[PDB]
């Protein structure tokens, strides 16, 4: 996260990280939506151009973390995945449309102080919170800046990163990229002029965009980090899976294949 802060401990309990098992590697963030269902972007799993097609046995989910480096005895639950579900209409060969995926653990997790669900969005909360200028929050342990790929990249957060970014209005999102933008994504970050900066970057993909409701004082996931040109370039916005326009789906699979 480009210009984030160090996060307060237990700040985003829903924060899961995907590792590849051997060789050990942070792959993506994700959110804990239930004690057995982790939400993530489709592209952490399947992007055929970079031969990425990750099997269920290739991955492992670290929940309850704060440090990126350290195994922390007391906080931390390592699960493994029973199923990897990716949208039929995930369109990699164009514009990452319907970039969502949903992972069933092998084993339910016991919630603790530090491991606790996101709310998914409802009609009223989507409609009430998703307005341009409203600030949401993106988190994760990924690159603090746009980097040339070396293995030890140096730019890697110690502690989980948080930033707060304004939702930007669709004409402006459309206008910032040649890539065809569709209705199930939204963009966020500052305009040129607005004094302030911020973005997600590599390895923050899959992680939450959350907003907090002043109704009932709970947090909901509005977005998932999906894509963008660079990290934190002028005139470029960060693009997020619109979780609600894929909520009609978000229900359906957990309730199709259910037991």
């Amino acid at each position: 996260i480009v210009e984030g802060q160090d996060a307060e401990v237990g700040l985003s309990p829903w924060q899961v990280m995907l590792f590849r098992k051997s060789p050990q590697e942070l792959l993506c963030g994700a959110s804990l939506i239930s004690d057995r269902w982790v939400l993530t972007a489709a592209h952490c799993l399947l992007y055929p151009p970079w031969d990425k097609n990750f099997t269920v046995d290739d991955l492992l989910v670290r929940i309850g973390k704060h440090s990126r480096t350290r195994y922390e005895r007391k906080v931390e639950k390592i699960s493994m995945l029973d199923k990897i579900y990716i949208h039929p209409r995930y369109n990699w060969k164009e514009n990452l449309d319907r970039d969502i995926a949903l992972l069933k653990l092998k084993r339910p997790i016991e919630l603790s102080d530090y491991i606790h669900p996101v709310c998914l969005p409802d009609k009223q909360t989507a409609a009430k919170l998703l307005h341009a200028g409203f600030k949401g929050r993106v988190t994760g342990w990924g690159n603090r800046r746009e980097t040339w790929t070396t293995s030890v990249a140096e730019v890697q957060p110690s502690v989980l990163q948080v930033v707060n970014l304004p939702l930007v209005e669709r004409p402006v999102c459309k206008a910032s990229t040649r890539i065809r933008i569709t209705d199930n994504m939204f963009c966020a970050g500052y305009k040129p002029g607005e004094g302030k900066r911020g973005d997600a970057c590599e390895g923050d993909s899959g992680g939450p965009f959350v907003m907090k409701s002043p109704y009932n004082n709970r947090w909901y996931q509005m977005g998932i980090v999906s894509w963008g040109e660079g990290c934190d370039r002028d005139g470029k916005y960060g693009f997020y899976t619109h979780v609600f326009r894929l909520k009609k789906w978000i229900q359906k699979v957990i309730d199709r294949l259910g037991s």
């Binding site: 309990p13 709310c119 341009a132 907090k212 409701s213």
Partner: protein, 36 residues
């Protein structure tokens, strides 16, 4: 202690349930009421 499916949510333990507010929380709230 109890188990179930996805239930109450979105209130963090060491914040909402303790009635404490985190560092950055106040930006989001200030953007909200600066719009509608």
């Amino acid at each position: 202690t109890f188990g179930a499916g996805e239930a109450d949510c979105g209130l963090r333990p060491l914040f909402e349930k303790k009635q404490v507010q985190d560092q950055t929380e106040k930006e989001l709230f200030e953007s909200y009421i600066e719009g509608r």
